[PDB]
Design a protein around this ligand. Structure first.
Ligand SMILES: NC(=O)c1ccc[n+]([C@@H]2O[C@H](COP(=O)([O-])OP(=O)(O)OC[C@H]3O[C@@H](n4cnc5c(N)ncnc54)[C@H](OP(=O)(O)O)[C@@H]3O)[C@@H](O)[C@H]2O)c1
Ligand SMILES: NC(=O)c1ccc[n+]([C@@H]2O[C@H](COP(=O)([O-])OP(=O)(O)OC[C@H]3O[C@@H](n4cnc5c(N)ncnc54)[C@H](OP(=O)(O)O)[C@@H]3O)[C@@H](O)[C@H]2O)c1
Lengths: 355, 355
């Protein structure tokens, strides 16, 4: 079978044996795999996450496929499934996997397929334990690779909202930092969230005309240009935000969100920045956190329950939105195009097979 | 009646009319009032919190008293009560008070008796609406002024634990930053907490011999000298902490706690520092928060439910502890002694009357 990978030393096509499902696993024929920032990181230089003893890493962690061999599992041929990303590390299972919370496992206690220590999903076929395969409605198969990123936000919201559960919290405004695939998906999710947000805002740093600015305004949200208005200045210009969702990977934002939050608000952090120091007014951060009962919660990955919730959220998203968000689905024959990234490309995917 | 106050321009005795209870209020005869850091701040220069049109501020927010006139409330003569601290601002009630969550009210939407905008409890008598008077067991009357500070921690724990409620969290280690009255009370509370902590730690910066170090070690906790081991170095020397409770008011601690927290841990911030900037590695803060699913939650004040929970916690605290924590209860005749603060004085109170 063909797979798209990065060899130790740009993405290329590689040939490898079709895997065979061990007991408890099913054989899945890949349909479409989304391309994400992490995939670009790898194609960049992030060759650390390579599997032990391997000279290549098959890419892709956002996938959807069809079950071709149920083997001894309770799945059925033809079921449309989306795989979870985390798997037990080389040293075997542990408490996080035992108790079914691998998304809470710390560094070194897991592998993430297509990201660290284990091959991804950009291959014609792949296998996975039945417990990590989530059945989704057949009609979501075409954009099924979007279930995983929607999963990410379902988890982040669950933890952020749980932090405000000891009192009567009724938010009205939400602010998403970042106009990438995750931030835009999240803005649309907040538009339909049961918390009933009235005013939505999204931070970016693009000049018009720009398709991300267009999606933001079509969702009826307010586009905030960080070059004109820093996060901490937002309350002066617009309003204090009950809920902030950080998806930029810019450290200043994690600190400054505290000044933009309304009293009793919570900020969910999803960005993954590298070390970077700078002068911060920590007394202001510290005091606002305390005197205004605020919270900052970090979240990474997600698990089965979030993928299931994602299928419901998916049906509520505007159809025009899903069309404008996915800028290109490319056949394997033209896979390289899926990795060209410019301001006008938002979410791309590679199509391996159909039906 | 006599009251202890600070006049615009050290604490002194002042004479004022005994108040009369309006409808819905009871008249309380003060028994004992604890002295706290805020009281010292006022005696320092914090004369901003003075009541409008008043040239003095009666001190004290940690009090216990006996009901002498139930007026038209459902309280009974002789009931032992502890008052809550927050009251509606001059501009009348608002949603926070309407819904019974004044502890969540933002700046400017409340007064705190003895702290900002309203007179405290260091007077022979005081009144208060029945809804803000919490009945406590008669036998807790002698150290009843401790219910309010215990209240503070009951609320902070409730919010911090609520932030970890979306997954199976089972902490084993807890770290209290600060060896003041609030930190020491909190360390004893964690010793008996239902979460079953196995290893307790407390941060201070005192040289032996010191009575705060003695309380820490008698509770079977480990004393950590911040001059020898900074918060961020703690995991190297001892272990990562599942739960951190910050009660130092030192901004570096709020930032550094993130590096000391174990994966999936939460830090509760209670300190109130002034503005102070400095170089921080925000990328390290940001990334650890996200990749290890951590949370930081701020908390201030507390309300009725927490004062009620405090009465149960009080009975579980070691008797030797309560004896060592309260370094002096001084009769009104010698009130000034209650404000002398040195390393060997931990918690003091002023006794206005008995029984
Ligand atoms: N914790 C998790 O589970 C998880 C999962 C997926 C992704 N993430 C992280 O989430 C972040 C967002 O990922 P994505 O897939 O949406 O990433 P992305 O495609 O890189 O998008 C980030 C977006 O934020 C914008 N941005 C960066 N700095 C900005 C600034 N100072 N002001 C305004 N906009 C700014 C970028 O704008 P320009 O294009 O104009 O530079 C870009 O559009 C990344 O850090 C990623 O690592 C975390
Ligand atoms: N949010 C709320 O509702 C609330 C309620 C009450 C109090 N607070 C705040 O909570 C904090 C603690 O108050 P308290 O009544 O316990 O205050 P406190 O009596 O001032 O005690 C703070 C303690 O922390 C220690 N400390 C300060 N910096 C330190 C450092 N770098 N390393 C080690 N120890 C350090 C001090 O040690 P030394 O004596 O050796 O300097 C002191 O013993 C204050 O900031 C107060 O404003 C908040």
């Amino acid at each position: 079978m063909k797979a798209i990978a990065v060899k130790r030393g740009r993405p290329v096509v590689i040939e490898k044996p079709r895997p065979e499902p061990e007991s408890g696993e099913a054989l899945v024929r890949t349909l479409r795999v989304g391309v994400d920032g992490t995939d670009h990181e790898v194609i960049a230089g992030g060759h650390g996450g390579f599997p032990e003893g391997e000279d290549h890493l098959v890419l892709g962690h956002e996938a959807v496929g069809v079950v071709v061999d149920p083997n001894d599992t309770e799945l059925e041929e033809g079921d449309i499934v989306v795989p979870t990303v985390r798997r037990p590390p080389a040293s075997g299972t542990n408490e996080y996997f035992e108790r079914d919370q691998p998304d809470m496992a710390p560094d070194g206690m897991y592998f993430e397929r297509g990201i660290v220590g284990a091959h991804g999903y950009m291959s014609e076929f792949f296998t996975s334990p039945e417990k990590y395969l989530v059945r989704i409605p057949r009609s979501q198969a075409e954009l099924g690779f979007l279930i995983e990123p929607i999963s990410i936000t379902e988890k982040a919201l669950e933890h952020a909202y749980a932090s405000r559960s000891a009192f009567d919290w009724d938010p009205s405004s939400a602010f998403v930092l970042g106009n990438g695939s995750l931030g835009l998906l999240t803005l649309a999710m907040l538009k339909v969230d049961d918390k009933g947000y009235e005013n939505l805002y999204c931070l970016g740093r693009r000049d018009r005309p720009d398709p991300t600015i267009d999606i933001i305004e079509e969702l009826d949200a307010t586009y905030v240009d960080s070059r004109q208005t820093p996060v901490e200045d937002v309350p002066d210009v617009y309003e204090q935000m009950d809920f902030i969702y950080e998806a930029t990977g810019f450290p200043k934002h994690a600190i400054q969100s505290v000044q933009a939050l309304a009293p009793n608000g919570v900020g969910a952090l999803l960005g993954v920045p590298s070390d970077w120091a700078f002068e911060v007014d920590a007394g202001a951060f510290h005091r606002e956190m305390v005197l205004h009962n605020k919270a900052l919660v970090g979240s990474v990955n997600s698990h089965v329950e979030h993928f299931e919730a994602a299928t419901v959220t998916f049906t509520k998203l505007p159809k025009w939105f899903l069309e404008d968000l996915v800028t290109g689905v490319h056949p394997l024959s033209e896979f390289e195009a899926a990795f060209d990234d410019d301001d006008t490309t938002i979410k791309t995917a590679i199509e391996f097979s159909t039906v």
